[PDB]
């Protein structure tokens, strides 16, 4: 029932702080901080724990991973990634957490690894066809979608989907717009790609993917351009949290109602956060 905004960058400082949004009160409250400052961090939820995966602490691209227990309000380290990954996309499917792409400090990554909480270890799985940092990742109907990103030379409009039964990635329909630093979330059978950066412009635009038609369509734009934006879904609304508008690191937050096809502002974060990880628990 709460949206967590994890880490990020406020314009001056890479953040270890974490805050949680209660929609019933329309307010954010601070919760326990990460052990490590993490911007460009991937965040996902599995079995009552929030995992903060990788990121960048201001000096080092991180392979470390920590997990938040809301009953104890504390973070604990878990097994590290095989590879340092900032700008990493993270999603959960069938009891495993996938860390997709990112940047290790020297190289934009096509590699992918999966975390098994029962064994507390990461294992390599099939690599992406394309290196992708600043990639958005979401899960829909048994497939993991890797949306956009940056391959080291080009901001990407391409999209690929992972089938765990085959351990393979396949291309699907591309975005209308190249998007790195894009936020991605799934609601009612559609994947939304929110904001990002096309190589020249920080984006307010939003598009939605219908797997039945294998195509993307534009939906209502954000009020504010947002790259490095965190996106999560709660109770029929998509929240776009923080980001960067080209001039300013953002504390603002807006919510999308698909029934009205419109975005509305909600309570702002206490702290400006771009490169922020967002998850719902």
PDB file of C-alpha atoms in Angstrom:
ATOM      1  CA  UNK A   1       0.000   0.000   0.000  1.00  0.00           C
ATOM      2  CA  UNK A   2       2.976   2.379   0.040  1.00  0.00           C
ATOM      3  CA  UNK A   3       5.247   3.712  -2.694  1.00  0.00           C
ATOM      4  CA  UNK A   4       8.927   3.807  -1.759  1.00  0.00           C
ATOM      5  CA  UNK A   5      11.347   6.260  -3.373  1.00  0.00           C
ATOM      6  CA  UNK A   6      14.841   4.849  -2.896  1.00  0.00           C
ATOM      7  CA  UNK A   7      18.049   6.819  -3.303  1.00  0.00           C
ATOM      8  CA  UNK A   8      18.725   9.005  -6.303  1.00  0.00           C
ATOM      9  CA  UNK A   9      20.544  12.299  -6.725  1.00  0.00           C
ATOM     10  CA  UNK A  10      19.349  15.707  -5.535  1.00  0.00           C
ATOM     11  CA  UNK A  11      21.589  17.841  -7.756  1.00  0.00           C
ATOM     12  CA  UNK A  12      24.448  17.975  -5.254  1.00  0.00           C
ATOM     13  CA  UNK A  13      24.487  14.641  -3.449  1.00  0.00           C
ATOM     14  CA  UNK A  14      23.942  10.967  -4.181  1.00  0.00           C
ATOM     15  CA  UNK A  15      21.331   9.841  -1.688  1.00  0.00           C
ATOM     16  CA  UNK A  16      21.076   7.034   0.837  1.00  0.00           C
ATOM     17  CA  UNK A  17      17.725   8.329   2.052  1.00  0.00           C
ATOM     18  CA  UNK A  18      14.388   6.620   1.404  1.00  0.00           C
ATOM     19  CA  UNK A  19      10.836   7.927   1.723  1.00  0.00           C
ATOM     20  CA  UNK A  20       7.405   6.305   1.492  1.00  0.00           C
ATOM     21  CA  UNK A  21       4.157   7.670   0.062  1.00  0.00           C
ATOM     22  CA  UNK A  22       0.791   6.883   1.656  1.00  0.00           C
ATOM     23  CA  UNK A  23      -1.995   7.589  -0.891  1.00  0.00           C
ATOM     24  CA  UNK A  24      -4.635   7.702   1.837  1.00  0.00           C
ATOM     25  CA  UNK A  25      -2.849  10.667   3.450  1.00  0.00           C
ATOM     26  CA  UNK A  26      -1.223  11.998   0.239  1.00  0.00           C
ATOM     27  CA  UNK A  27       2.101  12.510   1.981  1.00  0.00           C
ATOM     28  CA  UNK A  28       5.667  11.226   2.026  1.00  0.00           C
ATOM     29  CA  UNK A  29       7.515  10.163   5.175  1.00  0.00           C
ATOM     30  CA  UNK A  30      11.139   9.192   5.621  1.00  0.00           C
ATOM     31  CA  UNK A  31      11.963   5.576   6.405  1.00  0.00           C
ATOM     32  CA  UNK A  32      15.258   3.845   7.208  1.00  0.00           C
ATOM     33  CA  UNK A  33      18.151   4.891   4.931  1.00  0.00           C
ATOM     34  CA  UNK A  34      20.206   2.606   2.733  1.00  0.00           C
ATOM     35  CA  UNK A  35      23.618   1.561   4.000  1.00  0.00           C
ATOM     36  CA  UNK A  36      25.071   3.003   0.777  1.00  0.00           C
ATOM     37  CA  UNK A  37      24.239   6.062  -1.306  1.00  0.00           C
ATOM     38  CA  UNK A  38      22.718   4.809  -4.568  1.00  0.00           C
ATOM     39  CA  UNK A  39      21.705   6.809  -7.644  1.00  0.00           C
ATOM     40  CA  UNK A  40      20.803   5.025 -10.849  1.00  0.00           C
ATOM     41  CA  UNK A  41      19.591   2.227  -8.581  1.00  0.00           C
ATOM     42  CA  UNK A  42      17.178  -0.537  -9.562  1.00  0.00           C
ATOM     43  CA  UNK A  43      14.452  -1.421  -7.093  1.00  0.00           C
ATOM     44  CA  UNK A  44      12.054  -4.348  -6.978  1.00  0.00           C
ATOM     45  CA  UNK A  45       9.762  -6.059  -4.478  1.00  0.00           C
ATOM     46  CA  UNK A  46       9.681  -9.781  -3.730  1.00  0.00           C
ATOM     47  CA  UNK A  47       7.956 -11.599  -0.860  1.00  0.00           C
ATOM     48  CA  UNK A  48       7.605  -8.658   1.439  1.00  0.00           C
ATOM     49  CA  UNK A  49      11.085  -7.185   0.918  1.00  0.00           C
ATOM     50  CA  UNK A  50      12.269  -4.264  -1.205  1.00  0.00           C
ATOM     51  CA  UNK A  51      15.594  -4.860  -2.941  1.00  0.00           C
ATOM     52  CA  UNK A  52      17.894  -1.988  -3.909  1.00  0.00           C
ATOM     53  CA  UNK A  53      20.182  -3.291  -6.647  1.00  0.00           C
ATOM     54  CA  UNK A  54      23.394  -1.621  -7.753  1.00  0.00           C
ATOM     55  CA  UNK A  55      23.611   2.065  -8.545  1.00  0.00           C
ATOM     56  CA  UNK A  56      26.337   4.645  -8.017  1.00  0.00           C
ATOM     57  CA  UNK A  57      27.475   6.109  -4.694  1.00  0.00           C
ATOM     58  CA  UNK A  58      29.207   9.215  -6.077  1.00  0.00           C
ATOM     59  CA  UNK A  59      32.577   7.523  -6.519  1.00  0.00           C
ATOM     60  CA  UNK A  60      31.922   3.879  -7.427  1.00  0.00           C
ATOM     61  CA  UNK A  61      29.503   1.898  -9.561  1.00  0.00           C
ATOM     62  CA  UNK A  62      28.029  -0.688  -7.235  1.00  0.00           C
ATOM     63  CA  UNK A  63      27.668  -4.450  -7.320  1.00  0.00           C
ATOM     64  CA  UNK A  64      26.149  -4.481  -3.839  1.00  0.00           C
ATOM     65  CA  UNK A  65      22.495  -5.192  -3.063  1.00  0.00           C
ATOM     66  CA  UNK A  66      20.451  -4.560   0.077  1.00  0.00           C
ATOM     67  CA  UNK A  67      16.941  -5.526   1.160  1.00  0.00           C
ATOM     68  CA  UNK A  68      14.406  -3.554   3.201  1.00  0.00           C
ATOM     69  CA  UNK A  69      12.114  -5.286   5.712  1.00  0.00           C
ATOM     70  CA  UNK A  70       9.164  -2.967   6.503  1.00  0.00           C
ATOM     71  CA  UNK A  71       8.297  -4.878   9.669  1.00  0.00           C
ATOM     72  CA  UNK A  72      11.738  -4.037  11.087  1.00  0.00           C
ATOM     73  CA  UNK A  73      12.223  -0.760   9.140  1.00  0.00           C
ATOM     74  CA  UNK A  74      15.806  -1.647   8.263  1.00  0.00           C
ATOM     75  CA  UNK A  75      18.028  -2.542   5.331  1.00  0.00           C
ATOM     76  CA  UNK A  76      20.357  -5.546   5.249  1.00  0.00           C
ATOM     77  CA  UNK A  77      22.933  -6.513   2.659  1.00  0.00           C
ATOM     78  CA  UNK A  78      22.302  -9.578   0.521  1.00  0.00           C
ATOM     79  CA  UNK A  79      24.442 -11.314  -2.104  1.00  0.00           C
ATOM     80  CA  UNK A  80      26.185  -8.925  -4.534  1.00  0.00           C
ATOM     81  CA  UNK A  81      25.806  -8.888  -8.291  1.00  0.00           C
ATOM     82  CA  UNK A  82      28.541 -10.513 -10.348  1.00  0.00           C
ATOM     83  CA  UNK A  83      28.947  -7.165 -12.143  1.00  0.00           C
ATOM     84  CA  UNK A  84      28.747  -3.560 -10.981  1.00  0.00           C
ATOM     85  CA  UNK A  85      25.599  -2.041 -12.499  1.00  0.00           C
ATOM     86  CA  UNK A  86      24.392   1.563 -12.378  1.00  0.00           C
ATOM     87  CA  UNK A  87      21.491   2.650 -14.532  1.00  0.00           C
ATOM     88  CA  UNK A  88      20.259  -0.922 -14.143  1.00  0.00           C
ATOM     89  CA  UNK A  89      16.704  -2.126 -14.732  1.00  0.00           C
ATOM     90  CA  UNK A  90      15.243  -4.550 -12.213  1.00  0.00           C
ATOM     91  CA  UNK A  91      12.091  -6.648 -12.313  1.00  0.00           C
ATOM     92  CA  UNK A  92      10.613  -9.653 -10.510  1.00  0.00           C
ATOM     93  CA  UNK A  93       9.201 -12.753 -12.195  1.00  0.00           C
ATOM     94  CA  UNK A  94       8.289 -16.105 -10.635  1.00  0.00           C
ATOM     95  CA  UNK A  95      10.328 -15.752  -7.507  1.00  0.00           C
ATOM     96  CA  UNK A  96      13.483 -14.346  -9.124  1.00  0.00           C
ATOM     97  CA  UNK A  97      14.804 -10.790  -9.330  1.00  0.00           C
ATOM     98  CA  UNK A  98      16.381  -9.917 -12.673  1.00  0.00           C
ATOM     99  CA  UNK A  99      19.051  -7.233 -12.995  1.00  0.00           C
ATOM    100  CA  UNK A 100      19.061  -6.112 -16.632  1.00  0.00           C
ATOM    101  CA  UNK A 101      21.845  -4.147 -18.278  1.00  0.00           C
ATOM    102  CA  UNK A 102      23.332  -1.040 -16.732  1.00  0.00           C
ATOM    103  CA  UNK A 103      26.852   0.367 -16.687  1.00  0.00           C
ATOM    104  CA  UNK A 104      29.827  -1.050 -14.787  1.00  0.00           C
ATOM    105  CA  UNK A 105      31.999   2.086 -14.863  1.00  0.00           C
ATOM    106  CA  UNK A 106      33.716   1.256 -18.160  1.00  0.00           C
ATOM    107  CA  UNK A 107      31.133  -0.578 -20.259  1.00  0.00           C
ATOM    108  CA  UNK A 108      27.432  -0.390 -21.052  1.00  0.00           C
ATOM    109  CA  UNK A 109      26.084  -3.857 -20.374  1.00  0.00           C
ATOM    110  CA  UNK A 110      24.091  -6.393 -22.343  1.00  0.00           C
ATOM    111  CA  UNK A 111      24.400  -8.945 -19.546  1.00  0.00           C
ATOM    112  CA  UNK A 112      21.559 -10.004 -17.245  1.00  0.00           C
ATOM    113  CA  UNK A 113      21.607 -11.871 -13.935  1.00  0.00           C
ATOM    114  CA  UNK A 114      18.897 -13.344 -11.708  1.00  0.00           C
ATOM    115  CA  UNK A 115      18.702 -13.489  -7.910  1.00  0.00           C
ATOM    116  CA  UNK A 116      17.232 -16.515  -6.132  1.00  0.00           C
ATOM    117  CA  UNK A 117      16.306 -15.504  -2.550  1.00  0.00           C
ATOM    118  CA  UNK A 118      16.143 -19.134  -1.418  1.00  0.00           C
ATOM    119  CA  UNK A 119      19.835 -19.560  -2.284  1.00  0.00           C
ATOM    120  CA  UNK A 120      20.838 -15.888  -1.798  1.00  0.00           C
ATOM    121  CA  UNK A 121      22.860 -15.844  -5.009  1.00  0.00           C
ATOM    122  CA  UNK A 122      22.914 -14.318  -8.468  1.00  0.00           C
ATOM    123  CA  UNK A 123      23.320 -16.303 -11.677  1.00  0.00           C
ATOM    124  CA  UNK A 124      23.821 -15.191 -15.255  1.00  0.00           C
ATOM    125  CA  UNK A 125      20.981 -15.628 -17.716  1.00  0.00           C
ATOM    126  CA  UNK A 126      20.717 -14.899 -21.444  1.00  0.00           C
ATOM    127  CA  UNK A 127      22.127 -11.495 -22.467  1.00  0.00           C
ATOM    128  CA  UNK A 128      20.221  -8.738 -24.207  1.00  0.00           C
ATOM    129  CA  UNK A 129      20.707  -8.333 -27.939  1.00  0.00           C
ATOM    130  CA  UNK A 130      21.763  -4.729 -27.250  1.00  0.00           C
ATOM    131  CA  UNK A 131      23.747  -3.094 -24.464  1.00  0.00           C
ATOM    132  CA  UNK A 132      21.309  -0.993 -22.411  1.00  0.00           C
ATOM    133  CA  UNK A 133      22.048   1.393 -19.542  1.00  0.00           C
ATOM    134  CA  UNK A 134      19.354   3.694 -18.244  1.00  0.00           C
ATOM    135  CA  UNK A 135      16.940   0.964 -19.315  1.00  0.00           C
ATOM    136  CA  UNK A 136      13.365   0.552 -18.104  1.00  0.00           C
ATOM    137  CA  UNK A 137      12.229  -2.945 -17.209  1.00  0.00           C
ATOM    138  CA  UNK A 138       8.789  -4.344 -16.479  1.00  0.00           C
ATOM    139  CA  UNK A 139       7.043  -7.716 -16.310  1.00  0.00           C
ATOM    140  CA  UNK A 140       3.820  -8.626 -18.093  1.00  0.00           C
ATOM    141  CA  UNK A 141       2.262 -12.068 -18.578  1.00  0.00           C
ATOM    142  CA  UNK A 142       5.362 -14.102 -18.003  1.00  0.00           C
ATOM    143  CA  UNK A 143       7.759 -11.938 -20.032  1.00  0.00           C
ATOM    144  CA  UNK A 144      10.316  -9.339 -18.972  1.00  0.00           C
ATOM    145  CA  UNK A 145      10.488  -6.292 -21.232  1.00  0.00           C
ATOM    146  CA  UNK A 146      13.651  -4.202 -21.547  1.00  0.00           C
ATOM    147  CA  UNK A 147      12.593  -0.793 -22.850  1.00  0.00           C
ATOM    148  CA  UNK A 148      14.930   1.773 -24.362  1.00  0.00           C
ATOM    149  CA  UNK A 149      18.174   2.763 -22.708  1.00  0.00           C
ATOM    150  CA  UNK A 150      21.577   3.728 -24.068  1.00  0.00           C
ATOM    151  CA  UNK A 151      24.088   1.406 -25.729  1.00  0.00           C
ATOM    152  CA  UNK A 152      27.189   3.596 -25.325  1.00  0.00           C
ATOM    153  CA  UNK A 153      26.660   5.461 -28.591  1.00  0.00           C
ATOM    154  CA  UNK A 154      22.902   5.733 -29.193  1.00  0.00           C
ATOM    155  CA  UNK A 155      19.781   6.394 -27.170  1.00  0.00           C
ATOM    156  CA  UNK A 156      17.477   3.509 -27.955  1.00  0.00           C
ATOM    157  CA  UNK A 157      13.919   3.191 -29.186  1.00  0.00           C
ATOM    158  CA  UNK A 158      14.217  -0.593 -29.355  1.00  0.00           C
ATOM    159  CA  UNK A 159      12.520  -3.008 -26.966  1.00  0.00           C
ATOM    160  CA  UNK A 160      13.142  -6.692 -26.294  1.00  0.00           C
ATOM    161  CA  UNK A 161      11.332  -9.333 -24.242  1.00  0.00           C
ATOM    162  CA  UNK A 162      12.746 -12.206 -22.177  1.00  0.00           C
ATOM    163  CA  UNK A 163      11.001 -15.587 -22.019  1.00  0.00           C
ATOM    164  CA  UNK A 164      12.286 -17.504 -18.957  1.00  0.00           C
ATOM    165  CA  UNK A 165      11.015 -20.815 -20.330  1.00  0.00           C
ATOM    166  CA  UNK A 166      13.314 -20.438 -23.355  1.00  0.00           C
ATOM    167  CA  UNK A 167      16.007 -18.282 -21.627  1.00  0.00           C
ATOM    168  CA  UNK A 168      16.073 -15.953 -24.610  1.00  0.00           C
ATOM    169  CA  UNK A 169      15.417 -12.344 -25.581  1.00  0.00           C
ATOM    170  CA  UNK A 170      13.445 -11.388 -28.662  1.00  0.00           C
ATOM    171  CA  UNK A 171      12.800  -8.023 -30.257  1.00  0.00           C
ATOM    172  CA  UNK A 172       9.326  -6.544 -30.037  1.00  0.00           C
ATOM    173  CA  UNK A 173       7.837  -3.340 -31.457  1.00  0.00           C
ATOM    174  CA  UNK A 174      10.013  -0.238 -30.918  1.00  0.00           C
ATOM    175  CA  UNK A 175       9.019   2.918 -29.096  1.00  0.00           C
ATOM    176  CA  UNK A 176       7.986   5.901 -31.193  1.00  0.00           C
ATOM    177  CA  UNK A 177      10.720   7.884 -29.408  1.00  0.00           C
ATOM    178  CA  UNK A 178      14.222   7.001 -28.246  1.00  0.00           C
ATOM    179  CA  UNK A 179      14.168   6.941 -24.432  1.00  0.00           C
ATOM    180  CA  UNK A 180      17.057   6.488 -22.007  1.00  0.00           C
ATOM    181  CA  UNK A 181      16.537   7.108 -18.318  1.00  0.00           C
ATOM    182  CA  UNK A 182      12.961   6.002 -18.943  1.00  0.00           C
ATOM    183  CA  UNK A 183      10.512   4.821 -16.284  1.00  0.00           C
ATOM    184  CA  UNK A 184       8.422   1.764 -17.088  1.00  0.00           C
ATOM    185  CA  UNK A 185       5.431   0.244 -15.339  1.00  0.00           C
ATOM    186  CA  UNK A 186       2.614  -2.191 -16.085  1.00  0.00           C
ATOM    187  CA  UNK A 187      -1.081  -1.534 -15.534  1.00  0.00           C
ATOM    188  CA  UNK A 188      -4.069  -3.541 -16.764  1.00  0.00           C
ATOM    189  CA  UNK A 189      -2.309  -5.340 -19.549  1.00  0.00           C
ATOM    190  CA  UNK A 190      -0.338  -2.374 -20.915  1.00  0.00           C
ATOM    191  CA  UNK A 191       3.298  -1.366 -20.452  1.00  0.00           C
ATOM    192  CA  UNK A 192       3.818   2.378 -20.043  1.00  0.00           C
ATOM    193  CA  UNK A 193       7.094   4.056 -20.991  1.00  0.00           C
ATOM    194  CA  UNK A 194       7.246   7.339 -19.089  1.00  0.00           C
ATOM    195  CA  UNK A 195       9.580  10.208 -19.899  1.00  0.00           C
ATOM    196  CA  UNK A 196      13.278   9.707 -20.467  1.00  0.00           C
ATOM    197  CA  UNK A 197      15.775  11.380 -22.777  1.00  0.00           C
ATOM    198  CA  UNK A 198      15.963  11.016 -26.551  1.00  0.00           C
ATOM    199  CA  UNK A 199      19.554  12.241 -27.034  1.00  0.00           C
ATOM    200  CA  UNK A 200      18.564  15.879 -27.413  1.00  0.00           C
ATOM    201  CA  UNK A 201      15.503  16.470 -25.225  1.00  0.00           C
ATOM    202  CA  UNK A 202      14.231  15.448 -21.812  1.00  0.00           C
ATOM    203  CA  UNK A 203      10.784  14.029 -22.435  1.00  0.00           C
ATOM    204  CA  UNK A 204       7.335  14.696 -21.041  1.00  0.00           C
ATOM    205  CA  UNK A 205       5.791  12.208 -23.453  1.00  0.00           C
ATOM    206  CA  UNK A 206       4.402   8.804 -22.488  1.00  0.00           C
ATOM    207  CA  UNK A 207       3.513   5.800 -24.634  1.00  0.00           C
ATOM    208  CA  UNK A 208       1.798   2.485 -23.918  1.00  0.00           C
ATOM    209  CA  UNK A 209       2.499  -0.980 -25.321  1.00  0.00           C
ATOM    210  CA  UNK A 210      -0.319  -3.426 -26.080  1.00  0.00           C
ATOM    211  CA  UNK A 211       1.139  -6.966 -26.337  1.00  0.00           C
ATOM    212  CA  UNK A 212      -1.947  -8.235 -28.152  1.00  0.00           C
ATOM    213  CA  UNK A 213      -1.278  -5.782 -31.003  1.00  0.00           C
ATOM    214  CA  UNK A 214       2.519  -5.540 -30.508  1.00  0.00           C
ATOM    215  CA  UNK A 215       2.472  -1.771 -30.859  1.00  0.00           C
ATOM    216  CA  UNK A 216       3.052   1.408 -28.887  1.00  0.00           C
ATOM    217  CA  UNK A 217       0.608   4.312 -28.755  1.00  0.00           C
ATOM    218  CA  UNK A 218       0.951   7.777 -27.265  1.00  0.00           C
ATOM    219  CA  UNK A 219      -1.012   8.606 -24.143  1.00  0.00           C
ATOM    220  CA  UNK A 220      -1.338  11.836 -22.167  1.00  0.00           C
ATOM    221  CA  UNK A 221       1.994  13.591 -21.481  1.00  0.00           C
ATOM    222  CA  UNK A 222       3.424  14.416 -18.087  1.00  0.00           C
ATOM    223  CA  UNK A 223       3.066  17.977 -16.852  1.00  0.00           C
ATOM    224  CA  UNK A 224       6.869  18.047 -16.462  1.00  0.00           C
ATOM    225  CA  UNK A 225       9.700  16.623 -18.547  1.00  0.00           C
ATOM    226  CA  UNK A 226      11.286  13.818 -16.509  1.00  0.00           C
ATOM    227  CA  UNK A 227      14.374  11.739 -17.277  1.00  0.00           C
ATOM    228  CA  UNK A 228      15.855   9.484 -14.632  1.00  0.00           C
ATOM    229  CA  UNK A 229      12.294   9.161 -13.364  1.00  0.00           C
ATOM    230  CA  UNK A 230      10.993   6.389 -11.106  1.00  0.00           C
ATOM    231  CA  UNK A 231       7.634   4.874 -11.968  1.00  0.00           C
ATOM    232  CA  UNK A 232       5.364   2.574  -9.996  1.00  0.00           C
ATOM    233  CA  UNK A 233       1.746   1.405 -10.049  1.00  0.00           C
ATOM    234  CA  UNK A 234      -0.603   1.426  -7.070  1.00  0.00           C
ATOM    235  CA  UNK A 235      -4.382   0.945  -7.018  1.00  0.00           C
ATOM    236  CA  UNK A 236      -5.018   1.763 -10.631  1.00  0.00           C
ATOM    237  CA  UNK A 237      -2.725   4.795 -10.872  1.00  0.00           C
ATOM    238  CA  UNK A 238       0.760   5.157 -12.328  1.00  0.00           C
ATOM    239  CA  UNK A 239       3.046   7.423 -10.310  1.00  0.00           C
ATOM    240  CA  UNK A 240       5.948   9.288 -11.908  1.00  0.00           C
ATOM    241  CA  UNK A 241       8.369  10.168  -9.117  1.00  0.00           C
ATOM    242  CA  UNK A 242      11.150  12.711  -9.371  1.00  0.00           C
ATOM    243  CA  UNK A 243      13.548  12.825 -12.275  1.00  0.00           C
ATOM    244  CA  UNK A 244      15.257  15.667 -14.109  1.00  0.00           C
ATOM    245  CA  UNK A 245      13.603  18.151 -16.462  1.00  0.00           C
ATOM    246  CA  UNK A 246      16.752  19.362 -18.238  1.00  0.00           C
ATOM    247  CA  UNK A 247      17.448  22.151 -15.758  1.00  0.00           C
ATOM    248  CA  UNK A 248      16.280  20.940 -12.354  1.00  0.00           C
ATOM    249  CA  UNK A 249      16.320  17.745 -10.317  1.00  0.00           C
ATOM    250  CA  UNK A 250      12.721  17.203  -9.294  1.00  0.00           C
ATOM    251  CA  UNK A 251      10.915  16.622  -6.018  1.00  0.00           C
ATOM    252  CA  UNK A 252       7.544  16.668  -7.756  1.00  0.00           C
ATOM    253  CA  UNK A 253       5.345  13.619  -8.310  1.00  0.00           C
ATOM    254  CA  UNK A 254       2.372  13.101 -10.619  1.00  0.00           C
ATOM    255  CA  UNK A 255      -0.164  10.303 -11.047  1.00  0.00           C
ATOM    256  CA  UNK A 256      -1.788   8.955 -14.215  1.00  0.00           C
ATOM    257  CA  UNK A 257      -5.416   7.808 -14.247  1.00  0.00           C
ATOM    258  CA  UNK A 258      -5.987   5.618 -17.340  1.00  0.00           C
ATOM    259  CA  UNK A 259      -9.757   6.026 -17.108  1.00  0.00           C
ATOM    260  CA  UNK A 260      -9.347   9.791 -17.589  1.00  0.00           C
ATOM    261  CA  UNK A 261      -6.081   9.612 -19.592  1.00  0.00           C
ATOM    262  CA  UNK A 262      -4.583  12.453 -17.583  1.00  0.00           C
ATOM    263  CA  UNK A 263      -1.816  13.205 -15.106  1.00  0.00           C
ATOM    264  CA  UNK A 264      -2.362  15.086 -11.847  1.00  0.00           C
ATOM    265  CA  UNK A 265       0.184  16.316  -9.338  1.00  0.00           C
ATOM    266  CA  UNK A 266       0.306  14.669  -5.915  1.00  0.00           C
ATOM    267  CA  UNK A 267       2.368  15.426  -2.809  1.00  0.00           C
ATOM    268  CA  UNK A 268       6.053  16.145  -3.542  1.00  0.00           C
ATOM    269  CA  UNK A 269       9.020  14.264  -2.159  1.00  0.00           C
ATOM    270  CA  UNK A 270      10.892  15.802   0.753  1.00  0.00           C
ATOM    271  CA  UNK A 271      14.052  15.594  -1.383  1.00  0.00           C
ATOM    272  CA  UNK A 272      14.724  16.142  -5.072  1.00  0.00           C
ATOM    273  CA  UNK A 273      15.562  12.737  -6.565  1.00  0.00           C
ATOM    274  CA  UNK A 274      16.705  11.903 -10.091  1.00  0.00           C
ATOM    275  CA  UNK A 275      17.999   8.444 -10.900  1.00  0.00           C
ATOM    276  CA  UNK A 276      15.618   7.263  -8.191  1.00  0.00           C
ATOM    277  CA  UNK A 277      14.328   3.718  -7.738  1.00  0.00           C
ATOM    278  CA  UNK A 278      10.648   3.288  -6.960  1.00  0.00           C
ATOM    279  CA  UNK A 279       8.701   0.254  -5.801  1.00  0.00           C
ATOM    280  CA  UNK A 280       5.325  -0.532  -4.244  1.00  0.00           C
ATOM    281  CA  UNK A 281       4.763  -2.687  -1.179  1.00  0.00           C
TER     282      UNK A 281
END
